């Protein structure tokens, strides 16, 4: 008469291993979707730093290509 | 068997919660690597210009 509280007890602890499998394996999935907002801010400032360098060479290509016209 | 058969029906819920809620968290993570390749190319495009904007500020002394 003990083939159920002996059957379920091994399955009730075999499930605590999957609510544990997915428990911590979910705090993993968190730390990642938390690098997306920052990973965008990085792309943004670099895109921005870059455009400042794009235009900071198109203003130093006018006052330089010119001096090779008057020498 | 009545506090257990109430957990192989109860803990089959939280494993379905953390089942779906996890397929969700998988879609974002898909993009993360592309989001890195963007940061990388911009960091690099910027570094290209950062340096080119310098080698071109090298010929301001001569002219």
UniProtKB/Swiss-Prot annotation, chain A:
Mutation effect (residue 50 to A): Greatly impairs tandem ubiquitin binding,impairs oligomerization, impairs TNF-induced NF-kappa-B activation
Tissue expression summary: Heart, brain, placenta, lung, liver, skeletal muscle, kidney and pancreas.
Subcellular localization: Cytoplasm; Nucleus
Result of changing residue 59 to R: No effect on MARCH2F-mediated K48-linked ubiquitination
Glycyl lysine isopeptide (Lys-Gly) (interchain with G-Cter in ubiquitin and interchain with MARCHF2) cross-link, renumbered residues: 64
Documented effect of changing residue 15 to A: Partial abolition of sumoylation. Abolishes sumoylation and IKK activation
Effect of residue 67 to A: Impairs oligomerization, impairs binding of 'Lys-63'-linked ubiuitin, impairs TNF-induced NF-kappa-B activation
Subunit structure: Homodimer; disulfide-linked. Component of the I-kappa-B-kinase (IKK) core complex consisting of CHUK, IKBKB and IKBKG; probably four alpha/CHUK-beta/IKBKB dimers are associated with four gamma/IKBKG subunits. The IKK core complex seems to associate with regulatory or adapter proteins to form a IKK-signalosome holo-complex. The IKK complex associates with TERF2IP/RAP1, leading to promote IKK-mediated phosphorylation of RELA/p65. Part of a complex composed of NCOA2, NCOA3, CHUK/IKKA, IKBKB, IKBKG and CREBBP. Interacts with COPS3, CYLD, NALP2, TRPC4AP and PIDD1.
Protein name according to UniProt: NF-kappa-B essential modulator
Native species: Homo sapiens (Human)
Gene: IKBKG
Residues of the full protein shown: 263 to 333 of 419
């Amino acid at each position: 008469l003990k083939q159920q509280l002996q059957q379920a007890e091994e399955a009730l602890v075999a499930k605590q291993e999957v609510i544990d499998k997915l428990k911590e394996e979910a705090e993993q999935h968190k730390i990642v979707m938390e690098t997306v907002p920052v990973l965008k801010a990085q792309a943004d400032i670099y895109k921005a730093d870059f455009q400042a360098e794009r235009q900071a060479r198109e203003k130093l290509a006018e006052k330089k290509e010119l001096l090779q016209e008057q020498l």
